[PDB]
Amino acid sequence: SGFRKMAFPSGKVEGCMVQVTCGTTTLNGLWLDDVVYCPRHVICTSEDMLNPNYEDLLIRKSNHNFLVQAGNVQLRVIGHSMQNCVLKLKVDTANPKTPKYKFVRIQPGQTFSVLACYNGSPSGVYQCAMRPNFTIKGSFLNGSCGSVGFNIDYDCVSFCYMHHMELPTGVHAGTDLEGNFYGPFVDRQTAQAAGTDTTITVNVLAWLYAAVINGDRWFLNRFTTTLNDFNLVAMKYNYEPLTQDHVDILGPLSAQTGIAVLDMCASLKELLQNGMNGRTILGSALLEDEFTPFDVVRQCSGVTF
Amino acid sequence: SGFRKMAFPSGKVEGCMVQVTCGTTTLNGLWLDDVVYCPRHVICTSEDMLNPNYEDLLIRKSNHNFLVQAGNVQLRVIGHSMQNCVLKLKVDTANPKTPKYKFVRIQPGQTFSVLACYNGSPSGVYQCAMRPNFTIKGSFLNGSCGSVGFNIDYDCVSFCYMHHMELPTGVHAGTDLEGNFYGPFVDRQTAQAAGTDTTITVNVLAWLYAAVINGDRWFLNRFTTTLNDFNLVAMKYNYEPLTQDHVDILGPLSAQTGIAVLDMCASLKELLQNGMNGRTILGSALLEDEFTPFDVVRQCSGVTF
Ligand SMILES: CNC(=O)CN1C(=O)c2ccc(Cl)cc2[C@H](C(=O)Nc2cncc3cc(S(C)(=O)=O)ccc23)[C@H]1C
Ligand SMILES: CNC(=O)CN1C(=O)c2ccc(Cl)cc2[C@H](C(=O)Nc2cncc3cc(S(C)(=O)=O)ccc23)[C@H]1C
Ligand SMILES: [Cl-]
Fold this sequence. Notes:
The first copy, chain A, is of the alpha+beta class and about 300 residues long. In chain A, about 20% of the residues lie in helices and about 25% in strands.
């Protein structure tokens, strides 16, 4: 019993974190096999950040301009290349702690663990979700760039995020491990803002199924809804539209609890109208949207209470 | 910016988790040097759990009755002894991944990271606090016994909790690594219940300082109060008494924000007496009490391990 925002064990990722320095700039790098991956803005000074010409800044660099430190050992850089907004530093030593891994690009609503790092040294681990506006609500200070997001389903590490920046509202933006940003963001210190965010409807529904699995049914009702009527109401509360794909994805949780997806949708409609009236759901007074259908199945028992 | 329930990086602990099996019972063990630590109820059958005589159950066992598995390698047990509610299995191999460590007993209100394990294999990491009633609000299924709680200071892992059981309300109970239970609990399947819980006042105040650091000040007011007047207010809402020690501990956060502790107490008095009035603090509609003053400072400073 119980339900917590749970992160994956971070050990396989801690063994890959290194420190990357280029002149006066220091950030984190991910060391996999004989390559260190890091944000390309490590080659920028504070002046360069407004309109950097990365191709022109990079051509002026040699391998010895990059200092890579793995623990207390200096790694030797023997090559460098840029791929989108990521810098790839070829080093002379393959990481003996390289786990089994893949690079995956996630969609909004998907969750992942973040290993926050400073100076190549891990400080903490927390669970996150890619928001519908492609930002993440992380906890990051200066020096955290290069920190990564990941999932570890089975023994394989799927790296999905590399941290690049913090926006004026305090939320975070970054890229996949191929250097493609999530969202319409650029690695420039220019006027950038997160678009209006929305609630991840399929995740709130999944978390309502988790509450039912843990023995809480006070929020259920005798009503149902059509998918379109649910969306017409939900969007009035800034909730993302629920698609037929989301309904299919909720199938297993619907069968485990005996509650049809459109029946749980009616309960969500009523919760939005009434609030909780002094009650909580899984220890929360708000409707939680950072647990996916897959996360609930992963954490909860297969036997409903 | 940002504020998340953050756990310590779990790598140093993952390298110590093993599977312990005695007959038909399987749970997790902590392998440090040449000793495996696990709950003593691993020697019990379902019938024994009702009224076990552990010294008598243990005397009937030999070393080969215990199967210890570290990954896919079987460890050989060469000795066994009991210390309170923990079983200590002497093995023929010292753990080469043994980190620098200490066994520490924590007080209610203190937080720690939990590495949830099943069959000696880590599945997740989350943060929680030792409640004033000595239970923890964890997330644990069958097979999780032997999972451990810990903190990290530099390179030293301080093990503070070993998981033993789930109470009927879904909350959890366990021991320190010396086998002494936290709370008035016993390791048998008898009528046991969590006592009435209270809110950790010093932690709520710390989290209010974290909200101010992150730019949220709506709850601030011109008023102040005394420790004596605020403690009458705290007693009425099932909040733990605030002591002069708690006030001294909040000193650094008070100086960083410019808000006196009794001044922040006047804000909490008003939040308790009137609620949030539709507003949230750090994305929560409830007053959060599972962040200590030290957790707030560590997360708002970037301390690494
Ligand atoms: C908030 N940003 C800044 O003050 C300046 N700034 C940028 O705007 C920027 C733009 C594009 C890129 Cl690719 C990189 C950056 C950097 C950036 O955003 N780095 C950070 C990342 N994560 C977390 C942070 C947190 C902080 S804070 C405000 O908590 O001290 C401060 C910088 C943090 C720097 C140069
Ligand atoms: C809820 N437990 C039970 O029904 C029976 N029960 C005990 O009462 C007990 C008493 C003293 C000790 Cl030292 C040990 C236990 C065990 C225990 O509590 N083990 C578990 C630990 N953590 C989490 C769990 C979660 C579950 S569940 C409800 O998710 O299936 C099921 C057992 C979980 C077992 C035998
Ligand atoms: Cl995805």
